Design a protein around this ligand. Structure first.
Ligand SMILES: Nc1nc(OC[C@H]2CCC(=O)N2)c2nc[nH]c2n1
Length: 288
């Protein structure tokens, strides 16, 4: 760490305080994340150093000294939550929503092809630049360090239903669910399922997509946290959930929101959906 000068505190992340810093020898500007150390974790992280893709924030190095751990990442100038908030009066234009989704799907397809999951996608770990790129931050850190209840409260808004129902061996499909919620959020300017507890989260899902049963999700009634006493709500039309969105968009979103994780659309198949027939790469208006 003597090799870096901290420029400012960017914020609080899932695992610790995140700083903007400058490397004293190379001059590189980076994001430095303090992790608040078991062998297993160091090995896992170490493997993420080779999982390189243009839509994945680059892990530059891992620093482990005096039993403290710092991850050095590529620095981008803003996250999607701040971009959304700044764009609130008028919304992010559809072609840019579309471009970001496509690129995020490319990111996911890459990691998922190597069996690595994110597990904790949320606007705050989606980072953008001035060229129109968007990239996924903290990929793989969940399985390396776990996902805690508090850091700040950890948000449940983007969590897939299988996780909430206590499935122990969930799959890459959880990341597709998350991205779908984020897609809907971009389009409506409002979080799709803003739960404030685990049951509140589930019931928000059920209130919009219908309470899941054996017809839509074989095996669901056997999941560890499923209760027969869950209220049974009817599903709503996607026309009411994300109105602005045209039918291609609504079709894709519904496939990314399938209850059954084995039928939920994959990132690779999502990339082939007709929604992306006319995709382009616009540049955002960013005030840095
Ligand atoms: N600019 C920036 N910011 C980061 O974290 C931003 C998230 C953390 C908590 C928050 O509020 N936003 C990064 N992570 C890797 N590279 C980064 N570059």
């Amino acid at each position: 760490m003597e090799n870096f000068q901290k420029v400012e505190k960017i914020g609080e992340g899932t695992y610790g305080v995140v700083y903007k810093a400058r490397n004293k020898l190379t001059g590189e500007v980076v994001a430095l994340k303090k992790i608040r150390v078991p062998s297993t974790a160091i090995r896992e992280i170490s493997l993420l150093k080779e999982l390189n893709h243009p839509n994945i924030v680059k892990l530059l190095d891992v620093i482990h000294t005096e039993n403290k751990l710092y991850l050095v990442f590529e620095f981008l100038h803003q996250d999607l939550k701040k971009f959304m908030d700044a764009s609130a009066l008028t919304g992010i234009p559809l072609p840019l929503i579309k471009s970001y989704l496509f690129q995020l799907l490319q990111g996911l397809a890459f990691c998922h092809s190597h069996r690595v999951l994110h597990r904790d996608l949320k606007p705050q770990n989606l980072l953008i630049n001035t060229e129109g790129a968007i990239k996924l931050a903290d990929f793989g850190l969940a399985r390396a360090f776990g996902v805690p209840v508090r850091t700040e409260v950890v948000t449940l808004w983007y969590r897939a239903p299988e996780i909430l129902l206590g499935c122990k061996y969930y799959s890459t499909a959880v990341d597709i669910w998350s991205l779908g919620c984020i897609f809907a959020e971009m389009v409506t300017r409002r979080a799709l399922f803003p739960g404030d507890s685990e049951i509140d989260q589930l019931f928000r899902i059920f209130r919009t997509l219908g309470t899941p049963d054996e017809v839509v999700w074989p095996g669901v009634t056997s999941m560890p946290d499923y209760k027969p006493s869950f209220p049974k709500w009817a599903r709503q039309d996607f026309s009411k959930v994300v109105p602005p969105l045209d039918e291609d968009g609504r079709s894709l979103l519904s496939q990314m929101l399938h209850y059954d994780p084995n039928k939920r659309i994959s990132a690779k198949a999502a990339l082939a959906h007709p929604f992306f027939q006319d995709v382009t790469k616009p540049v955002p208006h960013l005030r840095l």
